Amino acid sequence: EIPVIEPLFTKVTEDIPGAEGPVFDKNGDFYIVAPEVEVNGKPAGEILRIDLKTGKKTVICKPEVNGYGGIPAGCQCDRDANQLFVADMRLGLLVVQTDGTFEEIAKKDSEGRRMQGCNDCAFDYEGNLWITAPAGEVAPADYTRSMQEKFGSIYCFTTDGQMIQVDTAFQFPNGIAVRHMNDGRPYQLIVAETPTKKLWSYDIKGPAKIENKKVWGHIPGTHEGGADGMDFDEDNNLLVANWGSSHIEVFGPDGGQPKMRIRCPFEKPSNLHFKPQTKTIFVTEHENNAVWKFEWQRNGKKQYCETLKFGIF
Ligand SMILES: [Ca+2]
Ligand SMILES: [Ca+2]
């Protein structure tokens, strides 16, 4: 018996193929990605800015490297600069400027191995970027994904520019989040393994240093799919989009089974993001390829881009 709530969901915008990676930059502007946009059967994913007032869409970037289009899927906003870090299933990790210019971060990791296509990412408060990589090698390699075979990896892009594969053998690692102690120190890394209906955790000992891999939680349902994107609220409750279940699961700090479920007026929630300093959660979903918003019980946990480099406390 798990309590379920049915809050009012308000449509923001639609017609965004594979709507994913909702994020707010330092100016408060809202962005999302459309990974499934295609031109002539070839990838032509886009990064869009959405006007929250009218809901009008503006494509600011259509990533492409050497004639190979991208499949942008997840985002995080930087702190020291107002730029976006985008996980791309075809191009790896991208840094995108608000004027639409972009740069591909790496073609190979620290060990010289070819970079894998990424899906989502999360910054810890020290500025390290944790990334899931469910795809195979980046372009120009043939596109493939670990939906059946276990070749999905996890990366950590350190503050000193190193791209380190921290673990592998995942069956489609998807959403990812970092739990911090009250003193702001990175404590645990939570990784969603979609098809297996599992949420995994690691203890963070330092930059690109994780240990004690554990099955942290279980996603409900026997439907095809499972945990996609996720984020923490200010009380460290973890909200997880359960693709294919019509619900967003709410886990307590200790994980295990959901302590609560949120019913959505659609079947495929993909990701979510809190509007800075509010209880408003923006949700992307793949049933109607649209963006919606609803009010949670409390404010979200501050993202890295909201913290101060030169603060006192
Ligand atoms: Ca995802
Ligand atoms: Ca998010």
Swiss-Prot record:
Optimum temperature is 35 degrees Celsius. Changing residue 231 to S: 3% increase in activity. 19% decrease in activity. Changing residue 286 to W: 44% decrease in activity. Optimum pH is 8.0. Pfam families: SGL (PF08450). Changing residue 194 to A: 60% decrease in activity. Its EC number is 3.8.2.2. Changing residue 271 to F: 100% decrease in activity. Has potential application in bio-remediation by detoxification of organo-phosphates used in insecticides or nerve agents used in chemical warfare such as soman, tabun and sarin. Transmembrane segments: none annotated. The active site is at residue 286. Changing residue 243 to F: 44% decrease in activity. The keyword Translocase does not apply. Its cofactor is Ca(2+). Keywords: Calcium, Hydrolase, Metal-binding. It comes from the Eukaryota. One of its GO terms (molecular function) is calcium ion binding. It is an enzyme of class 3 (hydrolase). Biological function and substrate unknown. However, it is capable of acting on phosphorus anhydride bonds (such as phosphorus-halide and phosphorus-cyanide) in organophosphorus compounds (including nerve gases). This is Diisopropyl-fluorophosphatase. It comes from Loligo vulgaris.
